Every structure is written in structure tokens, then in C-alpha cells.
Design a protein around this ligand. Structure first.
Ligand SMILES: *[C@@H]1O[C@H](CO[C@@H]2O[C@@H](C)[C@@H](O)[C@@H](O)[C@@H]2O)[C@@H](O[C@@H]2O[C@H](CO)[C@@H](O[C@@H]3O[C@H](CO)[C@@H](O)[C@H](O)[C@@H]3O)[C@H](O)[C@H]2NC(C)=O)[C@H](O)[C@H]1NC(C)=O
Ligand SMILES: *[C@@H]1O[C@H](CO[C@@H]2O[C@@H](C)[C@@H](O)[C@@H](O)[C@@H]2O)[C@@H](O)[C@H](O)[C@H]1NC(C)=O
Ligand code: NAG
Ligand code: NAG
Ligand code: CA
Ligand code: CA
Ligand code: CA
Ligand code: CA
Ligand code: CA
Ligand code: CA
Ligand code: CA
Ligand code: CA
Ligand code: CA
Ligand code: CA
Ligand code: CA
Ligand code: CA
Ligand code: CA
Ligand code: CA
Ligand code: CA
Ligand code: CA
Ligand code: CA
Ligand code: CA
Ligand code: CL
Ligand code: CL
Ligand code: CL
Ligand code: CL
Ligand code: NI
Lengths: 428, 428
């Protein structure tokens, strides 16, 4: 029947006087018989330990200090319903409202918020953040959030229901670890207070890597030279591909990328994890001058995009073949010369070869001894001719010996000995 | 001394007359005397089994059919140097060159060329392709390559080592497996002849996957309701994230996200590999009405961009609290009523509550027995009043029993019995 409303701020000194219920009850129509200061008693009340009416004085006192933010959380109104009974079965419902105060500033449970975002995070990617804690009601509760001004990240606030706000992170534009790996920001939450209260958190963003870089060689093509007969495990060329990715994604492994049936496979090797290309087989300039290696560098991660380069290994000619002498008699027989052989008569023809090339293969010849014969060398063919008088007695037979010498370093020689004999007049 | 150069095509019939060595040499100055088949002899020649000069006739004839592509491979020139010696130690060097013919068409050894390219292949990255095989020399060897006209891939021709033509593949525009995984193209090799000869092979291109799709929920937020006291392991909600990637990259694993020290953690659980959110603890509407679950779906593998959604799980109120009856007398004494009690005089006040809500919390009261008393209902307080004649003798004491019943399903009752006594004059 009878209703009395009141209101008082929260967190007030315990034992506060809200109002004299006797005054406003009599004024409003109560059966307060003169009954030794005990006319009415509280039937039941929402908060036994917080508010109490005095049967003696007939006054509303706060039993303890009121913390509205615990009773009603964010509920818009905070009323303690308290019902009193009179001496003769009469009732007065009394509803006291607890006005909220901005005694709480928004709070973050974590001192810092560390996050990991892949550099491949599409712009628009959003990450829900732990909303701050402000137990005040509505207006005095958390209202907005702010992040350190930047271009890469933004904050978007949404209200699930009846405010109760939370704010998520948003990648605003493309990230890239290889440019900036870490970010450090500051988030502050703000409540709707006359002098608004704030909370703070440090926001560390570690940009997780993505295998978005492929190995790359300094050059597409290379050219190397190797002297023939280079011993096994001789350094040909050490390739250096670069991958700026992180860990496995940035680790390069070299290997050969060609068909597997060619001589190259057997001749050379590569150190896959280091990049050293060495000679393992028989390299002979005389057999082949050049070899083509197709090397691929590959990263150890997902979406492994390999990169290739071609190395032209030219073999170099060392002077490792002696000059070969070959005597040519007309009838492949013992060289006989007549005594009366006029100066300059040809005896036998000589030919020299050399499997090398250049100055290593080019030859020059000599005729040893004091013998009466000269060796005039012609283009690629040295001829022996008679020089002097031939006496059957003073010299019946000679043992001509030809030397051949190349122009390599170290130079090489060769010797060939053939016997010549002198005749009177033989018609064989 | 004397040089005679000649030329002849390959693959000619056997016993061909290249040139008349006797005539050419004699005109060129050589010991051509009329002798019994003994004017000169071939000293040595590059290929004995291929070409030979005969002193009897004096002609440069070929022994068999010559295949230049075997002798000199791609070597630019193919010369056979025959050395001839005359009667009087005179020499005529002869070099016969073998002109190449397009008797070989370029051919590929494999039927198809299998390739694997990551959909993340940046436009411009190239994959060296296996060069075709044509043993002809220079112009007549492999010259250019051609692929099926398309937009995604192109061909690039390059020259590595003094010829040795090769063509690598080049990506023209971005690939995407989630749109098209396999490609079927045709490559043809061509040689440099008037009627060019070709070879062909099928080129299968498999687009290897890249984790370039993140899990995605159907909607941004969800809302579900669950009756309180739902037993452990009850279906709350079935989340369903989608990821079109391949294998691991497309496999979603759901899990809980948010602050760790939260009530929710103990109440619910989620099936990580399936996405079923089941209840683990006891839910009580009377304690809390709503709960906020933050679920994240993330794919296994690299560059895991997770997706989040918020589930607002609202609890439902079951009628699981009985209506509490509570009678309160003036001084909490045995209820005494005066004999001369006029109809409608108040005896004792009743108050009933119910911790439930809605019709589950709404109560209605009853008075049992034939007793001379009424229970007239007020808002929140049922009053007991006198309705009959109170005779000390006919009825000295009553044992009034009040029932209370809520409007839930199944409805709940409660009973409270107090004794009333009748008296004429009270002096205390
Ligand atoms: C025709 O003449 C040559 C030249 O021999 C020499 O002529 C002079 C220039 C002096 O050097 C003399 O000492 C000698 O006769 C003969 O060639 C040489 O033949 C000798 C004997 O056969 C070879 O001796 C050998 O040498 C090797 C190492 O060089 C030793 O290991 C052997 O044990 C042995 O002593 C010699 O190598 C060879 N060449 C040279 C440059 O000395 C040739 O034999 C001769 N022919 C005839 C038919 O008389
Ligand atoms: C007072 O009465 C209580 C209820 O008894 C009930 O009486 C009728 C109306 C039915 O509801 C019947 O089912 C019950 O027996 C008793 O339980 C109680 O004992 C009585 N008081 C005393 C002091 O005995
Ligand atoms: C590759 O080159 C870079 C740049 O000069 C250098 O820092 C790095 O040490 C080189 N690595 C190898 C393996 O040569
Ligand atoms: C998710 O929903 C799709 C329909 O869009 C369905 O094909 C798929 O099977 C569902 N996922 C699971 C795990 O059942
Ligand atoms: Ca407070
Ligand atoms: Ca407050
Ligand atoms: Ca606040
Ligand atoms: Ca990058
Ligand atoms: Ca990277
Ligand atoms: Ca990489
Ligand atoms: Ca050699
Ligand atoms: Ca050599
Ligand atoms: Ca030499
Ligand atoms: Ca041929
Ligand atoms: Ca040919
Ligand atoms: Ca050809
Ligand atoms: Ca894709
Ligand atoms: Ca994909
Ligand atoms: Ca995926
Ligand atoms: Ca309950
Ligand atoms: Ca309930
Ligand atoms: Ca109930
Ligand atoms: Cl921004
Ligand atoms: Cl890593
Ligand atoms: Cl002819
Ligand atoms: Cl569990
Ligand atoms: Ni003789």
C-alpha cells in the first residue's frame, strides 16, 4: 500500500542517515500507534547487511559501506527493496536507490599484451582484444579505447549488448617482417566520467614470418675455368644465393637441376648446404673443353620456389702431352743414301704432332750429333737433307736422332733414333 | 706445303667421288710422274674408315656413308685432314669438310614434362625446362620452342654456351590452386631449316598448394540458449569454420580464446578437431543469465591466420526452486486472536517468494481446512483475516496450514502450518 523511495550515493561512511522514515511515513499515512518506540518492523529486505530501519527512532541507516558496483554490476538502476510491517498488520514498501560513482578507473588485467601476427595477414584481419575492466555502471563504465596512432593497425570497437564494449585489433594495410619485425604500441581505455579515468596496456606485436621470399642468385649466369687434371675435390665455384626469410624459410640448399644422365653428374659435385662446386672426375681438355652445370637453390620452407643459374665450366689446356715424332720413309724401310748425294738431297721426311693446343701443342725439332745432315723444318713437317761429304770408310753408317720440343710450361721433349746407311750404287 | 680443301655433304651413298686429288694436286704443283701405280701414299688421315685416296686412280672417294652428326656432334666445322707423300718426299695436306644436313628432327625423350609450381609463384619466376635433342649442327639444331597459347605461362628462349639453345618457363600472371589445380599444355621444339622439323611433348603442370586461405566462420557472432542444470556433456553449439586450402593447410582446429582466468573456462569445453561446444559444469540461471565464449578457428601449418567469433550463450530458467512461505506475526509469537474478532480483522501476515523468474517465480497461496479464516491476496503479501464466529468452546485452537504454488512446469508447492488460539481478554 504505502511506498517510500529514497536515493543515496555509494561508498558512503557506514552508519549514514538516509532519511527519517517516521517523518515521511506519518506524513504519507502510517498507523504509528504510540507503542514504546516499537510500532513497526522490517519484514524482509534485499540487503540485510547494508541497510536497516530502526524500530526505536524510525530512521533509515546504512549498516555498512555500500559498494554499488558489486550489488548491481552494470545494471542501470540499483534499488534495495526493503519491506516494513506495522503494529497492526500494515505494510510499507521502501525502495532505496544507490546512485553510482566513478570510483573505479578502467583496468587491464595484463600489464602488456603480446601478439603474433603473420606478415601474410590480409588487411582486414582482426584480432579480439581482452576488454578492460571497469565495474561502474553505464555512463561511468568503459566507453572507448585508443591505440598509439599508426598506419598499419587500427582499433574497432563493438558493443555486444547494452554497451558492454570490447575492441578488436585490425590490420589496416599489408605487413612485412623483412622490413619491420616488431611493433610497440600503447592502448588506453577511457570511461565516461566528468574527469574521465583511464587504463593502459603495452601492446607488443611480433610479426611472424612467412616464406614469401625465394632464393636469389647474384647473377643468372656464371663462367668458370678449371685446369685439366685438377685433382678430386678441387674448388670450381662456390655459389651464394640469398633468402631474407626467417629460419628454415631463409636457409638455402643448393643442388643440381638437370637431366641425370650427363657426364657433368659424374665429373662435379656440389656441397648442398654450403654451395661449393668441386671437381671429382677426370677432366681432360683433350676430350672436352667445356661443361654446363644448372644449379638450383631452394629454401627449406613451404611454397618452396627454387631459383636457378647456369655455370659454364671451361676447361684449360695444360701441357701434359709430349710431342710425338713419326719418321716417314717412302717405302717404310731402312734409310739408304748414296755416297755421291749432292748437298741438299732429301733423306727422310719427319712429322711431329702434339695432342695439346696453342703453345703447348706447337713443336720445334732438332737433329743431334756432328752428323753430315741438316733438319730444315717446314710447316708442320721437318725434312732431313744431306749436308757434307759421305765417305764409306770414315762413316759407313750413322745413327741419326731427332728431338722434338713443345712450347708449353714445363716444356716436354721426345727423341727418336733411326739409322742411315751409305751405299755405292745399288739398284734394288 | 700444299693445301687442298674440299667439301661434301653427309649421308651420301658409299663410294662417292669427293674430288680428283691427282688433278688438283698436280695442277697445284706436286710430283706427278708416270710411274707404275706409285706416285704418292696417304701418310695418315683423320678418318681411315671414312675417306681414302688411292694412288692407282687418284680420286678422293668415301668408303661408306658418313654421318656428320656422329663425328663432330655440334662442333661448328667437321674436317678430315688426309696427308699424302710424293715420290720425292713432297707432301700435300688435304682437308675435306663434311657439310651437315637436317636429317634429324628435334625430339623429346619423355612423353610428357611433369612440373610442380606453388600457387604462390610470383609472376616472373622461371623454371628452366628440359631442352630438346637435335644432333644437327648450329642452325640445323634446336632453335626455338613453343607452348599452347595461354595467359598463365609463357616461354623464354636463351643461349648459354656458344649455342646450346634452351627455353625456360616463365609465369605471366598469378596462379591459384583453389581455382585451377592442373594444367595440360603442349610444347614443340624447332630447328633452323627451310622446312623446319618439330618435336612435341605433353606438359602437365601441377599447382602445389599454399596456405593462402584462413578459416572463416559463417557469421561474425552467434547466439544460443541452454536450460540451466543441463547435465555434463550437453550440445551447446556446433561451430563450422571453412578453409579451402589443401590437406593440413585446409584442416581447421577450433579452440577457446580470451583471458585465461575466466569463469567460462570451467563451464564449457570445445571439440578442437570437430568444433562441438559441450557443457562441462553446472549452469544456474539464478547465479548468471549469460556467458560470453570466444572461439577461434585456426588451420594447421604455416602462416596460420586465425579467425574468431563470439558466442553469447544465454541460460534459461527452469522451475527448480519451490515457493517459500513465510508467515510473520507481530512479535513472532503463537498466533492469538481475540474471541470478539469482527469479520475481516487481520490475524497474521504472509509473504511468499521464489528464487526463479517469470511464471516459475510467480506464486499463489491457499488455505486448507473448513476453518473460519480468509486469505485475501495483496501485491507480494497475502493477508490472513477472520471470517467466522470464534467460540472458545466449539473451536478452541486451529492448526491453520498455508500452501504456496508456483506457475512453472512441473509446478512446485510448499506447506507451512501454524496454530491459532482464541481468547477473550489478554492482559500481557
Ligand atoms: C743412337 O744414339 C742415341 C744417342 O745416344 C747417346 O749419344 C750421345 C749423344 C751420348 O749421349 C752417348 O752416351 C749415347 O750413345 C741413343 O740413344 C740413347 O741410347 C742409350 C743406350 O741405348 C740410352 O741409355 C739409357 O738411358 C736411360 C736413361 O736415359 C737409362 O735408364 C738406361 O739404363 C740407358 O743407359 C739413352 O737413354 C738414349 N737416349 C739418350 C738421350 O741418351 C741410341 O741408342 C743410339 N742408337 C743406336 C742404334 O746406336
Ligand atoms: C497441522 O496440520 C498439518 C497438515 O495436516 C494436513 O491436514 C489436511 C488439511 C491435509 O493436508 C492432510 O494431508 C494433512 O495431514 C499436520 O501435518 C501437522 O501435524 C498439524 N500440526 C500439528 C501440531 O500436529
Ligand atoms: C653471400 O653474400 C653476402 C653479401 O656479400 C654475404 O654477406 C654472405 O656472407 C655471402 N655468403 C656466402 C655463403 O658466400
Ligand atoms: C560445414 O558446413 C558445410 C556447408 O556449408 C558442410 O558442407 C560441412 O560438412 C560442414 N562442416 C562439417 C565439419 O560438418
Ligand atoms: Ca564502488
Ligand atoms: Ca561505482
Ligand atoms: Ca569508471
Ligand atoms: Ca615479406
Ligand atoms: Ca618473409
Ligand atoms: Ca625463402
Ligand atoms: Ca690431358
Ligand atoms: Ca693438354
Ligand atoms: Ca705438348
Ligand atoms: Ca646425320
Ligand atoms: Ca645432320
Ligand atoms: Ca634438326
Ligand atoms: Ca589460392
Ligand atoms: Ca591455397
Ligand atoms: Ca588455410
Ligand atoms: Ca536453479
Ligand atoms: Ca531456476
Ligand atoms: Ca518456483
Ligand atoms: Cl590506423
Ligand atoms: Cl621458423
Ligand atoms: Cl667430280
Ligand atoms: Cl575437460
Ligand atoms: Ni738398297
Amino acid at each position: 500500500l504505502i511506498n517510500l523511495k529514497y536515493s543515496v550515493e555509494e561508498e558512503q561512511r557506514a552508519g549514514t542517515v538516509i532519511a527519517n522514515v517516521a517523518k515521511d511515513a506519518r506524513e504519507a499515512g502510517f498507523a504509528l500507534d504510540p507503542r514504546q518506540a516499537s510500532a513497526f518492523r522490517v519484514v524482509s529486505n534485499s540487503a540485510p547487511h547494508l541497510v536497516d530501519i530502526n524500530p526505536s527512532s524510525g530512521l533509515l541507516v546504512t549498516k555498512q559501506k555500500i559498494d554499488r558496483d558489486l550489488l548491481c554490476r552494470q545494471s542501470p538502476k540499483c534499488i534495495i527493496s526493503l519491506e516494513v510491517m506495522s503494529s497492526s498488520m500494515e505494510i510499507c514498501v521502501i525502495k532505496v536507490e544507490i546512485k553510482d560513482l566513478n570510483d573505479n578507473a578502467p583496468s587491464f588485467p595484463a600489464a602488456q599484451i603480446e601478439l603474433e601476427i603473420s606478415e601474410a595477414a590480409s588487411p582486414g584481419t582482426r584480432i579480439p582484444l581482452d576488454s578492460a575492466y571497469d565495474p561502474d555502471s553505464g555512463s561511468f563504465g568503459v566507453q572507448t579505447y585508443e591505440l598509439t596512432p599508426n598506419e598499419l593497425f587500427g582499433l574497432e570497437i563493438k558493443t555486444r549488448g547494452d554497451g558492454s564494449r570490447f575492441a578488436e585489433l585490425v590490420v589496416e594495410k599489408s605487413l612485412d617482417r623483412e622490413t619491420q619485425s616488431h611493433y610497440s604500441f600503447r592502448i588506453t581505455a577511457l570511461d565516461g566520467g566528468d574527469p574521465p579515468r583511464l587504463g593502459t596496456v603495452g601492446l607488443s606485436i611480433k610479426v611472424t614470418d612467412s616464406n614469401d621470399n625465394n632464393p636469389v642468385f647474384s647473377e643468372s649466369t656464371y663462367a668458370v675455368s678449371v685446369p685439366e687434371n685438377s685433382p678430386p675435390n678441387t674448388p670450381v665455384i662456390r655459389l651464394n644465393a640469398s633468402d631474407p626469410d626467417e629460419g628454415t624459410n631463409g636457409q638455402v640448399v643448393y643442388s643440381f637441376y638437370g637431366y641425370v644422365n650427363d657426364r657433368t653428374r659424374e665429373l662435379f659435385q656440389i656441397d648442398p648446404h654450403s654451395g661449393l662446386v668441386t671437381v671429382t672426375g677426370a677432366l681432360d681438355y683433350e676430350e672436352g673443353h667445356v661443361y654446363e652445370l644448372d644449379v638450383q637453390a631452394k629454401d627449406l620452407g613451404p611454397n618452396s620456389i627454387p631459383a636457378h643459374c647456369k655455370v659454364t665450366v671451361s676447361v684449360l689446356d695444360t701441357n701434359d702431352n709430349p710431342p710425338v715424332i713419326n719418321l716417314l720413309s717412302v717405302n717404310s724401310e731402312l734409310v739408304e743414301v748414296s755416297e755421291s748425294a749432292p748437298p741438299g738431297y732429301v733423306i727422310a721426311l719427319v712429322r711431329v704432332s702434339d695432342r695439346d693446343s696453342g703453345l703447348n701443342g706447337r713443336v720445334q725439332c732438332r737433329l743431334l750429333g756432328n752428323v753430315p745432315f741438316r733438319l730444315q723444318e717446314y710447316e708442320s713437317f721437318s725434312t732431313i737433307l744431306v749436308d757434307g761429304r759421305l765417305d764409306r770408310e770414315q762413316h759407313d753408317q750413322y745413327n741419326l736422332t731427332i728431338q722434338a720440343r713443345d712450347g708449353g710450361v714445363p716444356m716436354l721433349q721426345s727423341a727418336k733414333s733411326f739409322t742411315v746407311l751409305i751405299t755405292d750404287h745399288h739398284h734394288h
